[PDB]
């Protein structure tokens, strides 16, 4: 999971 | 006459903008995982009869100028028009590869009065991107006018990271398209999203390492300005  | 016409010769463009690699310069991260988004809007939007175009790695200058020049094609014979972008952003802002483009430029070029061909059909555009840098921690259980027929599905809700997984794709964009392949046939658009919303709410989960980042949530958000129901059948 990674963020934008 | 409470449904757009869909039924012209052609359903519309699905223009799919896909932002991976970002300038060094810029120190933007490559945005694993957004090929599979990609690869499952192509294909999603495919089967419900769009001309689609990818484009991948637009910097600001070719966003501006594709959408521009998407927007001066004659969409006559189109029942509507899809954009979906995949990147960073923050508020009211795309990046492309190089730096920003604000997102009321791009919507701009397709409103009513700039883009005759697309008056009175649906506009449709699908953001993955970051709408800021909160995290959500969950909780355990005549005329018309010129901005009307525009719809946003945005994946956050304002002001929120978006979250996407190196591995699946983005949560947002798996879950539409896992939607719009279940329920495309059966439901209007707006119902369409609204099981979107739920299965991004109670289905994903961030797991982090780092704890400022774990076992955050997302709920996406959907801004309609549409004036009638929407069936892609």
Redesign the interface.
Known sequence: ?4 | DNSYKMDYPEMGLCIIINNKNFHKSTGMTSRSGTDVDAANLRETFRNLKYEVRNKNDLTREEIVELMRDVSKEDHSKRSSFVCVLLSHGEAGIIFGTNGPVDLKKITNFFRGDRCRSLTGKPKLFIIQACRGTELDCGIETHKIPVEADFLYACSTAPGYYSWRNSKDGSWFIQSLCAMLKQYADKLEFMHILTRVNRKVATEFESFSFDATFHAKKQIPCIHSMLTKELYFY
Do not use: Q
Not at chain 1, 1 to 4: I, P
């Open positions: 999971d990674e963020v934008d």
